[PDB]
């Protein structure tokens, strides 16, 4: 969807007069989703270090 939007960077909504959230979406890339899930770090954060 973002590629289809950026290929049309002469027409709304990535162009013209975008609403701020749409402008932010057009600007920001798509981070990796699988790479961010990590159970060990989450459990370590939840558990007190003591």
């Amino acid at each position: 969807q973002r590629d289809l939007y950026l290929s049309q960077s002469k027409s709304p909504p990535c162009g013209g007069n975008p609403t701020p959230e749409m402008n932010t979406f057009c600007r920001t890339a798509i981070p990796d989703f699988i790479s961010t899930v990590n159970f060990v770090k989450k459990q370590n954060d939840d558990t007190p270090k003591d």
Partner: protein, 149 residues
């Protein structure tokens, strides 16, 4: 995934809707990959019961190629180890010959009563019948029955 969308999309994922401009096709495709609807019919496989079910039924045909169906089918195979699942002692002793086909609402064709708006000929009676009964009542009833089974 398709929760926010509607007449105007609401919480808690309004930002996804505004990104997609209130279009849900890219996510109903996700749903159809997840459990089938609607690329393989309006109703398909549901979330499997992963408990020890000796009478589990394998899904067959196109529904075999969905995530939930694949998990259900995988749950039945036996590993190279010797079997360790005990089927119920008497499944035919307790029988429930209950069929939901008795309460099926069929697809009726209504009289196409043509109205002629100047030079526009169309029967709103057939459209009303197909919409409110053949597609609203019928789908709701079939949805209840499908969950019921």
């Amino acid at each position: 995934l398709t929760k926010p969308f509607g007449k105007t999309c609401q919480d808690p994922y309004s930002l996804l809707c505004t990104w997609f401009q209130n279009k849900s096709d890219k996510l109903i495709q996700i749903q159809s990959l997840i459990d089938g609807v609607p690329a393989l019919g309006q109703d398909g496989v549901k979330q499997p019961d992963l408990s020890d079910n000796p009478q589990r039924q394998s899904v067959s045909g196109p529904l075999s190629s969905t995530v939930y169906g694949f998990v259900n089918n995988s749950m039945m195979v036996q590993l190279p180890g010797q079997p360790g699942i005990k089927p119920l002692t008497f499944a035919n002793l307790i029988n429930f010959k209950v069929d939901t086909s008795l309460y099926y609402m069929k697809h009726q064709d209504f009289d196409c009563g043509r109205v002629k708006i100047l030079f526009f000929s169309f029967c709103l009676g057939r459209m009303m019948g197909d919409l409110f009964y053949n597609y609203v009542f019928r789908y709701v009833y079939n949805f209840f029955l499908a969950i019921f089974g």
